[PDB]
Design a protein around this ligand. Structure first.
Ligand code: 5GT
Length: 113
């Protein structure tokens, strides 16, 4: 029951804060199938922050949960594909932790609207 423009402004800010936690920029673009050619064998919906930005501006995120679901996909795809003893897996754990705090505060702001 809120206005669209401030909500999208909030999602844009939140997406930027989430990208800021991905200091290695390993989640900024789709996992490159050129370097990971079997990635799609068990990853049924790849996700990344560039795709999320495209989805945002295409008005595909009209509630907080749909935005957060695609963030969670970035994390879960990485935990699924990569072995636990890899930098990639640990980076997804850290993103889940740091991004979770970003999302909780952003959702508080959206609920104020
Ligand atoms: O799960 C992931 C997360 N992103 C990523 C970037 C680059 C590469 C690679 F280019 F292959 F080094 C692999 C991955 N795998």
């Amino acid at each position: 029951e809120m206005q669209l423009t401030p909500f999208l402004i909030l999602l844009r800010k939140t997406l930027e804060q989430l990208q800021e936690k991905d200091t290695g920029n390993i989640f900024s673009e789709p996992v490159p199938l050129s370097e990971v050619p079997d990635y799609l064998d068990h990853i049924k919906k790849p996700m990344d922050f560039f795709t999320m930005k495209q989805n945002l501006e295409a008005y595909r995120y009209l509630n907080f949960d749909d935005f957060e679901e695609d963030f969670n996909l970035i994390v879960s795809n990485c935990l699924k594909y990569n072995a636990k003893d890899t930098i990639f897996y640990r980076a997804a754990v850290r993103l889940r932790e740091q991004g979770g705090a970003v999302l909780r505060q952003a959702r508080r702001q959206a609920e104020k609207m």
